Amino acid sequence: SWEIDPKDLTFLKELGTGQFGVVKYGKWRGQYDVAIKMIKEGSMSEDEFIEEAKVMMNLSHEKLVQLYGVCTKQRPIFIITEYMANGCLLNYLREMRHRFQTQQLLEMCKDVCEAMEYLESKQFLHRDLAARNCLVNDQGVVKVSDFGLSRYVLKFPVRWSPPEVLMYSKFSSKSDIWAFGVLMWEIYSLGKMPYERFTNSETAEHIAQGLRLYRPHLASEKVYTIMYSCWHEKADERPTFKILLSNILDVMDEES
Ligand SMILES: *CCC(=O)N(C)[C@H]1C[C@@](C)(Oc2nc(-c3cnn(C)c3)cn3nccc23)C1
Numbered sequence: 369s370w371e372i373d374p375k376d377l378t379f380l381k382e383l384g385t386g387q388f389g390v391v392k393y394g395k396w397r398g399q400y401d402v403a404i405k406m407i408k409e410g411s412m413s414e415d416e417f418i419e420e421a422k423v424m425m426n427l428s429h430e431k432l433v434q435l436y437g438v439c440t441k442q443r444p445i446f447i448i449t450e451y452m453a454n455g456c457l458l459n460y461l462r463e464m465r466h467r468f469q470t471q472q473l474l475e476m477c478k479d480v481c482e483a484m485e486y487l488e489s490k491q492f493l494h495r496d497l498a499a500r501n502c503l504v505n506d507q508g509v510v511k512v513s514d515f516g517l518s519r520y521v522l523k524f525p526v527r528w529s530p531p532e533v534l535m536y537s538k539f540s541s542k543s544d545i546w547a548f549g550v551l552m553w554e555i556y557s558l559g560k561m562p563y564e565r566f567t568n569s570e571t572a573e574h575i576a577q578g579l580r581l582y583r584p585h586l587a588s589e590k591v592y593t594i595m596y597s598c599w600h601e602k603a604d605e606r607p608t609f610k611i612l613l614s615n616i617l618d619v620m621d622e623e624s
Contacts, residue, residue: 369422369425369437370418370421370422370425370437370438371437371438371439371440371441372396372436372437372438372439372446372448373439374439374442374446376396376397377394377395377396377402377404377439377446377448378394378395378396378398379392379394379404380392380393380394380395381393381394383403383455384455386405386514387514387517387518387521388405388406388407388408388411388412388447388517388521389405389406389407389408389411389444390405390406390408391403391404391405391406392404392406393451396436396448401451402436402448402449402450402451403448403449403450403451403452404446404447404448405446405447405448405449406444406446407444407445407446407447408444409443409444410522411521411522412445412520412521412522413519413520413521413522414440414445414520416519416520417438417517417520418438418440418445420516420519420520421435421437421438421447423492424515424516425437427486427487427490427492427515429482429483429486429487430482430509430511431479431480431482431483431486431509431510431511431512432483432486432487432511432512432515433449433450433452433503433511433512433513433514434449434450435447435448435449436448436449436450449513450505450511452503452504452505452511452513453504453505453506454503454504454505454506454508455503455504456499456500456502456503456504457476457499457500457502457503457504457510457555458498458499458500458502458554458559459559460504460559461499461554461555461558461559462558462559464558468558470556470586470587470588470591470623471620471623471624472508473555473556473586474591474616474619474620474623475510475620476510476555477551477552477555477594477616478613478616478617478620479509479510479511480497480502480510480512480548480551481548481609481612481613481616482613483511483512484497484512484544484548484609484612485608485609485610485612485613487512487515487544487609488541488544488608488609488610492515492516493515493516493539493540493541493543493544494512494515494516494544494547495515495516495518495519495539495543495544496514496517496518496525496528496547497512497528497544497547497548497551498525498528498547498550498551498554499551499554499555499559501513501514501515502551524568525547526568526569526571526572527550527561527562527563527568527571528546528547528550528551528562529543529546529547530542530543530546530599530603531575531576531601532603533546534572534575534576535576538603540603541608542603542604542606543603544609545598545603545606545607545608545609545612546598546599546603546606548598548609548612549594549595549596549597549598549599550562550581550595550598552587552591552594552595552598553581553584553595556584556586556587556591556595557584557586558586560584562581563581578601580596580599581595581599588619588623590618590619590622590623591619593615594612594615594616594619597612597615598612
């Protein structure tokens with residue numbers, strides 16, 4: 369049930385390259401748009417991934433990029449996902465022509481938070497949440513992509529990592545929370561790199577001294593309060609995604 373017959377795939381356009389190599393746009397059975405991730409040999413722990421794919425296919429949420437299945441009886445293996453016509457969220461933010469309103473930026477935050485509250489409720493960590501791992505569909509809806517997939521990569525995301533990850537490799541729901549707050553900073557900064565003048569090493573040292581990302585000027589005070597709450601030093605003092613969704617809904621109502 370997790371397995372797609374590659375004979376049902378028609379490869380139509382190269383979309384570009386991601387973590388595991390090329391991604392292509394194609395059709396399934398001549399009819400349905402799909403994205404086809406072609407997994408470069410040697411890059412992925414494929415047996416482990418295949419087993420986890422069965423779990424990932426039972427995860428269904430409107431704001432999660434859907435895994436349609438995998439093609440595993442060949443090399444390279446393929447991962448078949450929902451096609452997202454407007455590409456990577458990071459590139460989308462950086463296109464100044466969109467002239468985003470802040471209500472649109474908050475909606476992107478809500479989209480991601482909804483997906484992450486769903487993953488939280490399933491006790492599933494993303495482990496690499498960031499604007500580069502979100503995608504945008506033809507209706508401007510942002511969805512969370514490649515959740516959990518860093519576990520199978522045979523370059524660490526220092527700038528999306530809380531102190532207990534940098535110091536001790538303590539991953540938890542609350543390291544996804546921290547990364548979400550950095551993602552909100554990416555959205556309201558229109559895609560700047562977090563800690564844009566620092567190296568990864570400098571970022572980690574400054575985080576150790578309590579530096580935090582500055583308020584992007586497009587974020588209101590209440591929006592900054594939300595992303596800042598994700599960066600409490602003690603992981604247990606950071607909200608859940610359920611609390612964050614409620615805070616985002618509140619600010620959406622106040623700024624409507
Ligand atoms: C920001 C990081 C990045 O560029 N990623 C992750 C790329 C992987 C990629 C090529 O995958 C997809 N790209 C598109 C797409 C790219 N450009 N347009 C106009 C659309 C669409 N798509 N749907 C699913 C995966 C994927 C983006």
